[PDB]
Symmetry: C4
Subunit: 436 residues, 4 copies
């Protein structure tokens, strides 16, 4: 029975595996737990999940799947500005609803004022829908397949493809923007070159942009932040990797809408070994979030997430969202082809600081992870997992979990190594592990 303030303010250099959250009182069911989380000062998702901007994790496929399930994805920038922007465009155009370009096809089969060819099938035998209706109305109005929206003068003002109404109805947690499109985020560097790439990403319709760096507390990123906030006042920007409040302050002052917290704890990271710099994750998350919260800036616990327990712990310590690399790297929607080794299906996963991904000092390693299946199955599982944890701890929502932790109400307890060994599977001659 120790509070977070007490636990993380003794200088022990703790991490996720070094502690536990003590159970509380249950008076609701796991399915009643709400995971709504703030991605940035203005982006809010239904789940606190985010896919990392890496070669072997996030591209269109992942970004789309992740958005459809309740989270969001960040496309990597280890490609051409053109390619990256196309990946953003694919994601952005995956779901639209009221398509305008192809409806105003252009007018200026169907015979809808102006000269809207979609012509032959005259505007009398065809079903139409008034302007001002909503997607719900739109769906029923033509319960079949193929809906031309008409503006007073009976002029084609828009159209809505049945397929979009399907995707919309199929994914109730979909992270969509004001235009009913799957929101997407992208990662860029801080060199001048990144200004051009940013412009192409802007044109692509990217919603949030993260400045990629192992140590984001620099004059380069600060000025880059200020630039972006100037050129694109509304664009949501996330600050480079930080692990201390002093670093966060500079980026917060520069104008960040959120912070990416984590240094050298990612599965493929050797920065701590090579550069001696970094910080134990659990502590990094608590300290920066505790600070950043006084400025309304969401913290993204980035790195070291090996399972659901970690996710719940990051959130419990102050993080608004959690970013994963390896916990998603082997899913169907991640970049790369599957292969086999010792009868084990694998997909490549490599650190962005690896010589391959990149005198060059390698800060990442290149490996492979075992097949995790589809994001469409895995993410729902993580969502269920997180919910149960909130239940045991007695919290109906992630927002509540933090209040309980900050009020002192939520208690923790350190785990000795024997205690960590006891917490996992032990004393078995053999066993298999499954979760969903």
């Amino acid at each position: 029975g120790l509070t977070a303030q007490q636990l993380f303010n003794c200088g022990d250099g703790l991490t996720y595996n070094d502690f536990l959250i003590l159970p509380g009182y249950i008076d609701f069911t796991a399915d009643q737990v709400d995971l709504t989380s703030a991605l940035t000062k203005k982006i809010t998702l239904k789940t606190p999940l985010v896919s990392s901007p890496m070669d072997t994790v996030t591209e269109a496929g992942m970004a789309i799947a992740m958005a459809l399930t309740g989270g969001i994805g960040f496309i990597h920038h280890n490609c051409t500005p053109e390619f990256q922007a196309n990946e953003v465009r694919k994601v952005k155009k995956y779901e639209q609803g009221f398509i305008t370009d192809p409806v105003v096809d252009r007018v200026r089969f169907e015979a809808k004022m102006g000269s809207r060819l979609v012509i032959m099938t005259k505007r009398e035998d065809l079903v139409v829908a008034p302007a001002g209706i909503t997607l719900k109305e739109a769906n029923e109005i033509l319960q079949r397949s193929k809906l031309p929206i008409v503006n007073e003068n009976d002029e084609l003002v828009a159209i809505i493809a049945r397929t979009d109404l399907k995707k919309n109805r199929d994914y109730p947690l979909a992270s969509k923007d004001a235009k009913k499109q799957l929101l997407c985020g992208a990662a860029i560097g801080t060199h001048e070159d990144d200004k051009y790439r940013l412009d192409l990403l802007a044109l692509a319709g990217v919603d949030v942009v993260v400045l990629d760096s192992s140590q984001g507390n620099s004059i380069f990123q600060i000025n880059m932040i200020k630039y972006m906030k100037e050129k694109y006042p509304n664009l949501q920007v996330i600050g480079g990797n930080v692990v201390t409040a002093a670093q966060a302050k500079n980026l917060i002052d520069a104008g960040v809408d959120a912070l990416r917290v984590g240094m050298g704890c990612g599965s493929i990271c050797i920065t701590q070994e090579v550069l001696a710099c970094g910080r134990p994750q659990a502590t990094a998350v608590y300290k920066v979030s505790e600070y950043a919260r006084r400025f309304g800036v969401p913290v993204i616990a980035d790195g070291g997430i090996q399972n659901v327990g970690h996710i719940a712990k990051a959130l419990a310590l102050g993080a608004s969202t959690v970013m994963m690399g390896s916990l998603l790297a082997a899913t169907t929607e991640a970049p790369g082809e599957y292969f086999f080794s010792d009868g084990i299906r694998l997909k490549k996963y490599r650190g962005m600081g690896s010589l391959d991904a990149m005198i060059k000092v390698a800060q990442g390693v290149s490996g492979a992870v075992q097949d995790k299946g589809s994001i469409h199955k895995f993410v729902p599982y993580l969502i269920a997992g997180i919910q149960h944890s909130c239940q045991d701890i007695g919290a109906k929502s992630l927002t509540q979990v933090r209040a309980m932790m900050y009020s002192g109400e939520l208690k923790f307890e350190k785990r000795t190594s024997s205690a960590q060994v006891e917490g996992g599977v032990h004393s078995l001659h053999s066993y298999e592990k499954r979760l969903f």
Copy 2:
């Protein structure tokens, strides 16, 4: 030389392997140590041993063997109410003594008032025994095989099968109820459905019932407790898994006769890894027992028992009884068939939260343990083991061990990892381990 109060009140998150009990003064022999322990507020066994309510551990066979040796068993509820109740009935009818149903056979060979056929062999050549005698008397009275008990009017009032007098004489530590039957306990859930199952278990003659849950401090279990205490005033109820005094208080207030303490420390448990919730065992046991004792509520140290040292430590820290899963899972009396792998005989052992035992979030794993032989050999061994420990520590009884620990008299000392390595087998090129 550190007291329990000092040791477990520093927030280190200790477990069984993290400490030792310092030896005292010996002025008696190991065989003089008494292990009588309170299972619940009213159930008291000769030993502090209990078999866990799990698919691969407890069914009739185990429950019977465990009772015969001095402990008790809890039948799992991962079966039909009918099946479970039949398992309780088998155990309950294993030993009876004065059988009534078949003696009042019905009257209304032998020719005993009324019309008691057991007829031919007239009541004159046959040996009979008066009503009011005891089992001891009964045994001698017909020193052979096949004893009709007669009520004044020479009317068949009961019978006693020689076989029961045998089982009774063979097992001096047998956990029997007021009717000379092997007591049995069963595990149920907390859903409404469990009320029906409970009723069938009541009819079966179950003696103690444990409410099965990974986090028993809930409104569901509290109300279930209150229900049971109402409907079955005398039934002994044990509260769902708890690890803190605050949780215990709710269940104690709800009316529990004992508490099942343990969360995520069981050999097949992944709850700590998946849900981030739980608590290091040694500490869980000391803290809750220290509290629950002020209300006369026995604590069951449930989980993490890998050997005799653990059992003795749980007891020394405040537990009245100890529940095991893996330490019994491979015995002859446990559910399942034996098989072989690398020339090693094994029997399945799986967590009740495993996908097999059961979106579903797995909290347990499915494995196999190596053959441990019969409960009838293993339990006596654990009993001997525990006794020696009490001797080294200078305690003639489990009751004494707790007094010494609560008075400060009993001392402990933390074990560094090197100290733990030194405590076990080391520096050998090869070795085999045996214990009994």
Copy 3:
């Protein structure tokens, strides 16, 4: 720079591998270091080495070799009183000097008053030596082979075999008694039966006797101690295994001449795992020696010695001598035959609490260790090793090492696990280890 008092009085439960001794000032050579140590209140050896009383370690061969090199041995009692006593007799008669029985052969070749046949070779052609001379004189007096000692009346008063003068001259560190015989010690239990065995051991000429027990603070051993001190006033007795000052006090009060300190840290020990009782060695040694010293009672650091560093640390913490089991178990002089496994020569080593060595609760395990060669090579090596350690720490003698440690002058420092890893061999692709 931490003193022993500070280091071992924080309740951390440390052991040998958990700390280091910081180097001092060197103004002498390793060969100038003196290891003279008190075995008991009256037995003093040239080295602080002792072989453990175990089936696979100490018998005549070991006891003799160990004495010849500067230490001593304790014969095991897992044999008949006759056998054990014969093992003591073999050791005792290995070296004698002035043999009396065969010289007083009996008188009452050579023609020496009385009728000393050793006859033919008359007392005139034969060289003789006066009574009152010493062994040194004796050696030169007949610089060849085959010396009849003559008493005034020219009567055979004794004889001295050339072979004894050889053994005496060959081993300058030999642990011999007042009669120039290799001293020997033996281990006995505390049951009444041990009184008879003790008597046979007395007749055998045993010099020191250790009462064998895993927990020697008992009324059984206390009374046994008092008995022995009564019956054999001069016999040196060592107290059963203790690890705390409170235990030591009882045995010290009972009249022990030394204490055997150690519980569950021996390579083949499972007492800590099975009985939950014991104590981390380094701490056990410091605490009891710190106490026992106030009564002039030598402490024997028994158990957990895996190498020279451990020996030096035990001594530095207060032990007067060190007892080993595995560090000697595979030498030529130890009981048992050598065999081979994976091309590796081995000799059996088993705990005295193993089922084989012995319901029975096993407290020891049965294994094998790799061939260490002869005690006559290994012990000199340990002696050299210990000497260098004393040099680095700036102590010319074991006696000095303790003064420095008790005065505060000697400093220590805890070793984190990484620090322990760094202290040993690391970062090699492959390597072989040798020491002498």
Copy 4:
């Protein structure tokens, strides 16, 4: 956020792997970081790198390569004084510039006053250079191959081989002495014999000499130091291995120009295990440097360097330079021939206290390390690695890093074992590691 003073003054016995340096503010690039470091009170290198004086590490080849890249090398003394001195001579004569001996060839092709034959090619057709010019001038003056330097009377005063001007221009970081020669250092013992060897090393032109010992705080080394400072007033001397301020003081008082800090932490070291003496490196480095700095004496962090992180940490804690053995032992320039095992190329690496390198008490082990390539590639890599670390921590130079650490500005944080596990590569099914 803990200062070095706080971190290393709690008695925890920390080492490199036990802590991290928290990142600061970046306002410069990695390539702008300066690694200029003081080898001794008067020797200053461009990099803080030094090759250890060992059989399998440093000989001419290594010493030359190491100097050319920015560091320095110390030739081992496990050879004849003649051999060692020849190794110094090879290194010293590798690069010269203004060669005098062969130019004053002797005078007393070319026809340059006196009788300088280099004769035929008369002094009129040949290009010459005035005395007083510099190497830069010299290079251009004869932009081709084959430059006779002439003194007023047109007398051959010196010569400069084109090859030297090449080596000079190729290696901008070259550690050269006042005579434009690659500086070299050598290791000697402290016995009288070492005085002769020293004399031969003096004649060889050695620049710095390190007194080789595992425990240099001795009367032998102190007097040896005083001797050398007397006989060779200008010679730079480094004090034997020390790990505490008390030891450093004696050697500092004796007159050391630098200190070699480290005891039993070297990859091939078993001194801690065998002699129980030594100290955890990170702590050894901070404590002695913190002291030695008050006397302007540079500390050489010697031992335990397994990678770049360690190097940066040693420097951050107070060391002026870092000495490596295994981190260089398998390079092309190190002594020994390459061989193969399991398809892995290896080169021998052995501790100088190994029986092979040397009753003898082994303090080192004999193994093999995997091929690291050329020093000419590896050292530049370490240089780049160190620079990035300085960048993350916000320091433009090693000198700055220490100021920040001593002022309190630089912060650190302990790493729990889980934190250390998280810091390295984890959660991968497989991976390969590369760095340059």
